[PDB]
Write a protein that binds this ligand. Structure first.
Ligand SMILES: CCCCCCCCCCCCCCCCCC(=O)OC[C@H](CO[C@@H]1O[C@H](CO[C@H]2O[C@H](CO)[C@H](O)[C@H](O)[C@H]2O)[C@H](O)[C@H](O)[C@H]1O)OC(=O)CCCCCCCCCCCCCCCCC
Ligand code: CLA
Ligand code: CLA
Ligand code: CLA
Ligand code: CLA
Ligand SMILES: CC(C)=CCC/C(C)=C/CC/C(C)=C/CC/C(C)=C/CC/C(C)=C/CC/C(C)=C/CC/C(C)=C/CC/C(C)=C/CC/C(C)=C/CC1=CC(=O)C(C)=C(C)C1=O
Ligand SMILES: CCCCCCCCCCCCCCCCCC(=O)OC[C@H](CO[C@@H]1O[C@H](CO)[C@H](O)[C@H](O)[C@H]1O)OC(=O)CCCCCCCCCCCCCCCCC
Ligand SMILES: CCCCCCCCCCCCCCCCCC(=O)OC[C@H](CO[C@@H]1O[C@H](CO)[C@H](O)[C@H](O)[C@H]1O)OC(=O)CCCCCCCCCCCCCCCCC
Ligand SMILES: CCCCCCCCCCCCCCCC(=O)OC[C@H](COP(=O)(O)OC[C@@H](O)CO)OC(=O)CCCCCCCCCCCCCCC
Ligand code: HEC
Ligand SMILES: CC1=C(/C=C/C(C)=C/C=C/C(C)=C/C=C/C=C(C)/C=C/C=C(C)/C=C/C2=C(C)CCCC2(C)C)C(C)(C)CCC1
Ligand code: OEX
Ligand SMILES: [Cl-]
Ligand SMILES: [Cl-]
Ligand SMILES: [Fe+2]
Lengths: 170, 30, 334, 33, 244, 97, 202, 137, 50, 36, 32
């Protein structure tokens, strides 16, 4: 929450690439697992399909071919290359985490993507102009004033009631 | 100009989709 | 040879480059309607009075937004959960001001996306596959239903459904935290575990297979040319990967059965994301995160703050600032 | 909007330079086989 | 035989004023002695016209039609006030209370939204002298107050306001504040509007009357941010009269 | 020439006493005997030319006149500020706790 | 007080007040400094000296709070006006300047006093040319900031380079893949006493 | 810090007599206040009329004075407005209205004292939090 | 400030053959509150994209 | 608008009936192994 | 100098686009 109010960290493109890396990692994890389990070859007679794998068999245990036709027809593209697929599974979440790391290095220096200058200039001049970008900074402003005194006690912040930012009624 | 730039890039991605699907390297067996 | 039967044959043909199917028959129109309206609205829709207070929020590029700040804005709180198709507006100008396009898009998308999941079953049946890939996609689909339909239903307004934009998304998740303490909710914590764990096991599995590729190539060519699409032999040594990973931890924390391993890969992020979709879906009925505010007091009764009280101070600043003009009475009950 | 003028040239080059690189390498790959 | 809520709800008729039979061409006579009230005044607008800005000097811009975008939310109703007999026999209605405002926004050609506070607040409206009967030729003329569209707590999108909010452009901490004074310093406008009410139906039995109205007033100035537009509102009214 | 009228009114007696012509009605809780009854009346009968006009409020009992006299020094009158009286803001000005 | 010293005592030269995509020189933000205006001294109506609370670097925005030598809040710029007790208007806050361009001048009109107090949270008050560069008024970081950002980021990335090329050095024999005739007995447990040492079979 | 007798010592009446609660009475009163009163007065505020709180200084300026056990026990029997001018039993829980406010049915006379005691003790412990609202949470 | 002062190149070819109004309610003859139906400047442009 | 409403009701009914009757047209039999 | 700031991008694309075209054709020539 600190990073939202103070750094507007969700606005940061390096965080956004991390988000895509983690979420795309989780997607890859799930879609690869489900595909294997649902293009299995029938290698045993039982309804539990786990028993019919042997860690030392030469043969692939699922059909890359049927997997590829399935996903080509459902999604338009599919993997055709098992090596590339498993490297891509390494590549996606690793890169995403590396990108987020870089953005936090920037925030070490308070070098944030806090603002869009063009938005602020227009909004300062035009009180009818409102976007989700300006709505979110009001919230950051709330966060800072309301949490700072208790979250940074060494600063001895005293904010009398009348200076706290607050909307109507709340 | 920024509007044109945003939509232009988006338009390129959609075109790329088209070629990636219908003009892919066709997977060939063994 | 009959007309209807030839049509049925084409609808269900395994030979179309993209499979249609009977689910496809609903999916394609509805996703075209939602896509086309989204693109036009994102570029050129005028501002929308999301909160019903005659304070329109500019969401589109031509009204001064960029890719990061733009959105299709949710429909008006004055409408609530009333259905607002085009033909219920006096004019398109009214429909635009009140946020019609959001409704059109989310209903067409949720339909087409439900049919997407069904289409996954269908083609699985036409190809002689096992059928449950669609069960894995139900996790993302349930998540989209939660933020676009369920949470609005419980709070009584599509104005509180998730905006279709990048900063609108962040606005939704900040307001959610102030109103539901979602961070302190166990189902969101399982979502994080499902999603962090998912990215972890993605990296793990990819690095283990990649570590055990069998030499088929030279140092001047991509290793990927060592696998040929449709080859019968497996392309890595699983016993070598088991042998490394079981020594990295201990033997019995490692999988030598590729079927169990890949089923594990499927179930962990799917179940975690079910729970987090269930989180949004039940916070929709205001069964909120754990509340430990002032839970620790001393012998006299002074409040002794914890980290939960600090979280509360931040939630308070979100609460009192959001929709700063929309509340006239002291409690924000929805 | 009062927007960074150089954003345009920056974006165009950001797109154009890496894309042309990729195309160059692809086309001379096809001229081999 | 009147309707119920559940017959009306969702129809749009809740935003319509009651109508008088086209047979209703009588006259409500006035006893200089007795006193009278208006128990219900309903004003239902049908047309919103806005004055253009003609750029030159001697072309004087016209009123152009607008498109309503705020739906069936426009009518003033349950309005009540004193109805007095003046020394020279004119009547004067003094508004006391009622749902006597509605925010409205109409759209001009080209896209511009014009918000306005459609109101009759503090309305006083008089007749010609020597009335003695309200008839299908009786006219009321009067003026009312038009407060600021937003009241003093309203916060603009950067958090600035009159009775609450920031007093500067906090996103531009070392900007020169002189350019921004108009946007930074909010002002509560308070203007007057004019209305004519033309009686054209009268039920002599029940004291109900009804007719046409035209009012002229100013649109929203966004707390002094910009200059208002002139607005002309046409519609229909209904009122009911009681011996006080 | 662009002045915030509410801030300017904080520089008057309005900023130190209960202004019988402007102050929200919850201010009348700070002194005993005044809320809700007399405060209701004071507000509905505003505006006042002098602090002493409150006592000419029709219907005042003699006990009610005593309470007001007891508190005349805590009142003032300044010009009506439109921004503070519009919107029914003297009954509810959007401030709770 | 030399102007040079007073310009260091101003948060717009704090390298921790910038932003990633706020480009160019610091002069593009607050402008080209021209003169020290003077040191501002606030007093309430009782002649007490009041001290503006300075903005910490963490905060993009910061409220305006005035305190006495002892830390007690005695004035502020309120957000909600209706219950303000400490407004400049109520407290009779004045500002006087010693040194600089404004030396010896005192201001009492509230809007002006608030305005210098708004700047006094940034430390010492300067006059800027905002027009020459069309400065937008938003703080940017200094070369100290940019150099640190770039070298901390390059360093982190070069750690990956270290890991990549070190791996490639120590595993060159399997860069292209593992031995196609690795036997499960080398990889299975207990077979060798010492892992991978085929000379320690049982 | 602890729940000493000095903090548990509250005015009994306007005369100035005083009474020292036990820890038992205090916790008794806290429990009963949660049972019967906190749905509207959590933390010393009043959710359905935020202009009137349970701070000691507010109670003191109430007519009749309610900053004491006697005033508070009375209030719980026969509640009046803040100026004392009308009885509000019809809309405020009270023994006088336990028919419409059932939770008051089983409150005994000592229960009332424990509740009134809690109300007067809690500001001494929590300070401005008591009756101050979310600003002080 | 007619079209030919604003660098408009294709707007006059639409005007020439009868397209004169916009879905936003203005026409090039300066008449407001017009309903051009589909064949406004906007709809001609759309039809050429499709 | 009423013309738009009519048109959409029609288009929707059309697609929903394609769907209902499509699955009623012996869908279990359209697989590669055992047809019935 | 108050120059046309679209001149930088016009000049840059004027060079880049046709030059890239030539380079692409030349390289694919050298590899067959
Ligand atoms: C890839 C594989 C898949 C294949 C793909 C197939 C390719 C086909 C792709 C379709 C392309 C769709 C393009 C989007 C169309 C939306 C246009 C729109 O909505 O355009 C609608 C236009 C726009 O209307 C105007 O819309 C305006 C909206 O204003 C807004 O927009 C203005 C212009 O930007 C300004 O910005 C203005 O400020 C702002 O307020 C005003 O309100 C005008 O009054 C209003 O007339 O209306 C008109 O007259 C139109 C006619 C409707 C008149 C009403 C009669 C109803 C007729 C029934 C319609 C049937 C539809 C066909 C279905 C039948 C199937 C057999
Ligand atoms: C869609 C939602 C979403 C998603 C997917 C992410 C995803 C991410 N966020 Mg973001 N975040 C979001 C929303 C989201 N965020 C929002 C709304 C905010 C508010 C602004 C933030 C605020 C936020 C902050 C403040 C930070 C992130 C960070 C991160 C990254 C965490 C990387 C990681 O795995 O750390 C996990 C931690 C590690 C990998 C470190 C090492 C872990 C070791 C191996 C632990 C070993 C444990 C040991 C064996 C024993 C433990 C046992 C014990 C438990 C019993 C990742 C890219 C972080 C980031 O970007 O970092 C660079 C960060 O600091 N986010
Ligand atoms: C490190 C911090 C962190 C991390 C890791 C997470 C992680 C997560 N959060 Mg939490 N969150 C955080 C911090 C964090 N959050 C903070 C600080 C806040 C408060 C400010 C929140 C507030 C919050 C809220 C309010 C919500 C989350 C949600 C989520 C989940 C988002 C992913 C998801 O829903 O996938 C699920 C998958 C999807 C949503 C994808 C649906 C895909 C559809 C079906 C298809 C789309 C097709 C597309 C349009 C076209 C593509 C085709 C292409 C050709 C174009 C995930 C578990 C969300 C959640 O639980 O939702 C259920 C949620 O609503 N979080
Ligand atoms: C160590 C490198 C370094 C540093 C610290 C500086 C520092 C500075 N330069 Mg100098 N400069 C450098 C290298 C450097 N320069 C080089 C190599 C060039 C030649 C191009 C220049 C040319 C140059 C000019 C022409 C100007 C400066 C100026 C400046 C000042 C402002 C910088 C600014 O706004 O940055 C802005 C920084 C950013 C916007 C960050 C950009 C990094 C992006 C966001 C990362 C890209 C992400 C990537 C695509 C992610 C994908 C990865 C994934 C796919 C794997 C500052 C003192 C300006 C000045 O004031 O001079 C008077 C000025 O006009 N510099
Ligand atoms: C994640 C961290 C990490 C990892 C996994 C590696 C891994 C590797 N390094 Mg690299 N290395 C690192 C960080 C790392 N290094 C750092 C930070 C430096 C210094 C900048 C180096 C410098 C370095 C050199 C110069 C060389 C390697 C080499 C190697 C390879 C052989 C193993 C080796 O020499 O280990 C090195 C072992 C360690 C880094 C662990 C040391 C543990 C230290 C001594 C403990 C310190 C305790 C300290 C006193 C606590 C008190 C401090 C407190 C006050 C803060 C391998 C690829 C070699 C190579 O590539 O061969 C081909 C080689 O020549 N490394
Ligand atoms: C009109 C206008 C202009 C519209 C605007 C709309 C709008 C707002 C657009 C905004 C766009 C926006 C800016 C998005 C930004 C996205 C973002 C943050 C960028 C990420 C950038 C970046 C490089 C991130 C670093 C991390 C990174 C590397 C992440 C990569 C994520 C990713 C691509 C993962 C793959 C996901 C995916 C769906 C793969 C499916 C693959 C697939 C076909 C598998 C199927 C499959 C499985 C099997 O198992 C087998 C066996 C077979 C055979 C098989 O096939
Ligand atoms: C080969 C070249 C082709 C590739 C170029 C593609 C363009 C890429 C552009 C990327 C830079 C974005 C420029 C946007 C800024 C701009 O428009 O303003 C242009 C700004 C200069 O700023 C200009 O200065 C002027 C006065 O001199 C005025 O102030 C102008 O207003 C201001 O815009 O450009 C820079 O400062 C360029 C140098 C930046 C180098 C420092 C980077 C240090 C950070 C290290 C980051 C490493 C991260 C790697 C992560 C992996
Ligand atoms: C494709 C990739 C790009 C290719 C290279 C692109 C550069 C090509 C050169 C473009 C023209 C350069 C003009 C200078 C740039 C500029 O300022 O323009 C900018 C101008 C527009 O002008 C801008 O307009 C703005 C208002 O919108 C403001 O006025 C700006 O100040 C002004 O710059 O661009 C044009 O006007 C578009 C060009 C269309 C010209 C068509 C008429 C010419 C037909 C004759 C062709 C005959 C050629 C015979 C050759 C044999
Ligand atoms: C009817 C419904 C159909 C849905 C239509 C959707 C089509 C779009 C899907 C992708 C087309 C482009 C993929 C190109 C790239 C391409 O053709 O890849 C094709 C590639 C083929 O892999 P193979 O294993 O065959 O390659 C082996 C070797 O050639 C590698 O050297 O597939 C992948 O690598 C899978 C992972 C890519 C995953 C990329 C998907 C992400 C796309 C979505 C991102 C969009 C952001 C847009 C924001 C505006
Ligand atoms: C809502 C349903 C309430 C419950 C339950 C209780 N109280 Fe209450 N209380 C409520 C209101 C709306 C008011 C204001 C009444 C008015 O118009 O004056 C009050 C007031 C009090 C007071 C007076 C406070 C003051 O400033 O003088 C007291 C002392 C009080 N209430 C006590 C009290 C107790 C002990 C309760 C439990 C038994 C209780 N209240 C319940 C609303 C509600
Ligand atoms: C001229 C001009 C201009 C510019 C322009 C431009 C810049 C353009 C571009 C353009 C572009 C850039 C375009 C592109 C296009 C694209 C396309 C054409 C696409 C297509 C696609 C498709 C066809 C698809 C399909 C599909 C299917 C069918 C299925 C599913 C998948 C998919 C989706 C793939 C301006 C404005 C300045 C001005 C005026 C003039
Ligand atoms: O709208 Mn959207 O957000 Ca769910 O709560 Mn109430 O409402 Mn509004 O406030 Mn908080
Ligand atoms: Cl908000
Ligand atoms: Cl409310
Ligand atoms: Fe795998």
């Amino acid at each position: 929450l600190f990073f939202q109010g103070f750094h507007n960290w969700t606005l940061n493109p390096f965080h956004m690439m991390g988000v895509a890396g983690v979420l795309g990692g989780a997607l890859l994890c799930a879609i690869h697992g489900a595909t294997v389990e649902n293009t299995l070859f029938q290698d045993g007679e039982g309804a539990s399909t786990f028993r019919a794998f042997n860690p030392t068999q030469a043969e692939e245990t699922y059909s890359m071919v049927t997997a590829n036709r399935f996903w080509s027809q459902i999604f338009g593209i599919a993997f055709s290359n098992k090596r590339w697929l498993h490297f891509f599974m390494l590549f996606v979440p690793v890169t995403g985490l590396w990108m987020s790391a870089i953005g936090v290095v920037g925030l070490a220096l308070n070098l944030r993507s806090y603002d869009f200058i063009s938005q602020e200039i227009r909004a300062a001049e035009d009180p009818e102009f409102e976007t989700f970008y300006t709505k979110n900074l009001l919230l950051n402003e709330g966060i800072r004033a309301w949490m700072a005194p208790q979250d940074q006690p060494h600063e001895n912040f005293v904010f009398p009631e009348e200076v706290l930012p607050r909307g109507n009624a709340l | 100009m920024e509007t044109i730039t945003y939509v232009f890039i988006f338009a390129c991605i959609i075109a790329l989709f088209f070629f990636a699907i219908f003009f892919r390297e066709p997977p060939r067996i063994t | 040879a009959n007309l209807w039967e030839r049509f049925c044959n084409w609808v269900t043909s395994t030979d179309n480059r993209l499979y249609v199917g009977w689910f496809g028959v609903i999916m394609i129109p509805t996703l075209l309607a939602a896509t086309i309206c989204f693109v036009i609205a994102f570029i050129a829709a005028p501002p929308v009075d999301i909160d019903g207070i005659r304070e329109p929020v500019s969401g589109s590029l031509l009204y001064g937004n960029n890719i990061i700040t733009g959105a299709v804005v949710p429909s008006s709180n004055a409408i609530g959960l009333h259905f607002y198709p085009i033909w219920e507006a006096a004019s398109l100008d009214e429909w635009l001001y009140n946020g019609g396009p959001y409704q059109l898009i989310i209903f067409h998308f949720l339909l087409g996306a439900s049919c997407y999941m069904g289409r996954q079953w269908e083609l699985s049946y036409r190809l002689g596959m096992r059928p449950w890939i669609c069960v894995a996609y139900s996790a993302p689909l349930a998540s989209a239903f939660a933020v676009f339909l369920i949470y609005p239903i419980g709070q009584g307004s599509f104005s509180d459904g998730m905006p279709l934009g990048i900063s609108g998304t962040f606005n939704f998740m900040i307001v959610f935290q102030a109103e539901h303490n979602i961070l302190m909710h166990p189902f969101h914590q399982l979502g994080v575990a499902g999603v962090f764990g998912g990215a972890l096991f993605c990296a793990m599995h990819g690095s283990l297979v990649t570590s055990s590729l069998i030499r088929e190539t030279t140092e001047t060519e991509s290793a990927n040319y060592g696998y040929k699409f449709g080859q019968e032999e497996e392309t890595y040594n699983i016993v070598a990967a088991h042998g490394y990973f079981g020594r990295l931890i201990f033997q019995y924390a490692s999988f030598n059965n590729s079927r169990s391993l890949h089923f594990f890969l499927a179930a962990w992020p799917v179940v975690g994301v079910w729970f987090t979709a269930l989180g949004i879906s039940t916070m929709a009925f205001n069964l909120n995160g754990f509340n430990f505010n002032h839970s620790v007091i001393d012998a006299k009764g002074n409040v002794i703050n914890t980290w939960a009280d600090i979280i509360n101070r931040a939630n308070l600043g979100m609460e009192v600032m959001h929709e700063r003009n929309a509340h006239n009475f002291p409690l924000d009950l929805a | 909007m009062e927007v960074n003028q150089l954003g345009l040239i920056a974006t165009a080059l950001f797109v154009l330079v890496p894309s042309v690189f990729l195309i160059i390498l692809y086309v001379q790959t096809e001229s081999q086989q | 035989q009147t309707l119920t809520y559940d017959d009306i709800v969702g129809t749009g008729l809740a935003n319509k004023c009651p109508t008088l039979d086209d047979t209703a061409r009588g006259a409500y006579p006035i006893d200089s002695s007795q006193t009278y009230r208006i128990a219900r005044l309903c004003l239902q607008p049908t047309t919103f016209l806005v004055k253009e800005e003609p750029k030159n000097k001697r072309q004087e811009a016209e009123f152009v039609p607008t498109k309503l975008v705020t739906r069936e939310t426009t009518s003033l109703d349950q309005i009540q006030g004193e109805l007095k007999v003046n020394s020279d026999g004119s009547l004067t209605f003094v508004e006391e209370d009622g749902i006597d405002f509605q925010p409205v926004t109409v759209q001009m050609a080209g896209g511009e939204r014009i918000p306005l506070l459609f109101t009759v607040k503090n309305l006083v409206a008089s007749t010609q002298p020597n009335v003695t009967s309200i008839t299908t030729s009786t006219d009321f003329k009067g003026e009312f107050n038009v407060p600021s569209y937003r009241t003093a707590n309203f916060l603009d999108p950067k958090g600035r306001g009159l009775a609450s909010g920031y007093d500067s452009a906090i996103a531009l901490p070392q900007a020169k504040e002189e350019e921004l004074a108009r946007a930074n310093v909010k002002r509560f406008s308070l203007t007057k509007g004019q209305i004519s009410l033309n009686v054209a139906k009268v039920d002599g039995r029940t004291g109900e009357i009804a007719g046409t109205f035209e009012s002229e007033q100013l649109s929203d100035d966004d707390m002094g941010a910009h200059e208002p537009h002139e607005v002309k509102i046409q519609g229909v009214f209904y009122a009911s009269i009681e011996p006080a | 020439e662009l002045v915030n009228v509410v801030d300017e009114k904080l520089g008057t007696a309005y900023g130190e006493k209960i202004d019988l012509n402007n102050t929200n009605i919850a201010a009348f809780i700070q002194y005993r005997g005044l809320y809700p009854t007399l405060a209701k009346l004071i507000v509905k009968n505003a505006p006042y030319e002098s602090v002493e006009d409150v006592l000419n409020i029709p219907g005042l009992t003699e006990r009610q006149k005593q309470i007001l006299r007891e508190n005349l020094e805590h009142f003032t009158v300044t010009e009506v500020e439109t921004a503070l009286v519009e919107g029914g803001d003297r009954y509810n000005n959007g401030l709770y706790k | 007080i030399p102007e040079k010293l007073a310009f260091y005592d101003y948060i717009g030269n704090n390298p921790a007040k910038g932003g990633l995509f706020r480009t160019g020189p610091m002069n593009k933000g607050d402008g080209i400094a021209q003169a020290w205006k003077g040191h501002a001294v606030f007093r309430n109506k009782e002649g007490e000296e009041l001290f503006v609370r300075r903005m910490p670097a963490f905060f993009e925005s910061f409220p305006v709070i005035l305190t006495d030598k002892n830390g007690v809040v005695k004035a502020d710029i309120p957000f909600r006006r209706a219950e303000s007790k400490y407004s400049f208007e109520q407290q009779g806050v004045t500002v006087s300047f010693y040194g600089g361009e404004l030396n010896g001048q005192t201001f009492t009109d509230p809007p002006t006093v608030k305005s210098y107090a708004r700047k006094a949270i940034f430390g010492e008050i300067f006059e800027f040319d905002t027009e020459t560069l069309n400065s937008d008024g938003i703080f940017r970081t200094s070369p100290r900031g940019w150099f640190t950002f770039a070298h901390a980021v390059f360093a982190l990335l070069f750690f990956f380079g270290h890991i990549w090329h070190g791996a490639r050095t120590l595993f060159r024999d399997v860069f292209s893949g593992i031995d196609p005739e690795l036997s499960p007995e080398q990889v299975e447990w207990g077979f060798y006493q010492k892992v991978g040492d085929v000379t320690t079979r049982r | 810090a602890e729940l000493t007798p000095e903090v548990l010592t509250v005015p009994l009446n306007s005369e100035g007599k005083t009474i020292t609660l036990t820890e038992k009475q205090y916790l008794e009163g806290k429990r009963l206040f949660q049972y019967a009163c906190a749905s509207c007065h959590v933390g010393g505020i009043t959710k359905t009329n935020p202009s009137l709180d349970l701070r000691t200084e507010t109670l003191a300026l109430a007519t009749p004075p309610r900053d004491n056990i006697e005033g508070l026990v009375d209030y719980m029997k026969n509640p009046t407005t803040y100026d004392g001018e009308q009885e509000i039993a019809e809309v405020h829980p009270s023994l006088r209205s336990a028919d419409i406010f059932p939770k008051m049915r089983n409150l005994t006379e000592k229960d009332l004292v424990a509740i009134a005691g809690h109300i007067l003790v809690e500001p001494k412990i929590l300070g401005d939090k008591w009756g101050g609202g979310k600003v002080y949470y | 400030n007619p079209m030919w002062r604003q660098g408009m190149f294709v707007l006059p070819f639409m005007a020439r053959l009868g397209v004169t109004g916009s879905w936003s309610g203005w026409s090039i003859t300066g008449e407001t509150g017009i309903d051009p139906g589909f064949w406004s400047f906007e709809g001609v442009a759309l039809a050429h994209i499709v | 608008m009423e013309t738009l409403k009519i048109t959409v009701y029609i288009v929707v009914t059309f697609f929903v009936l394609l769907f209902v009757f499509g699955f009623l047209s012996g869908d279990p039999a359209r697989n590669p192994k055992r047809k019935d």
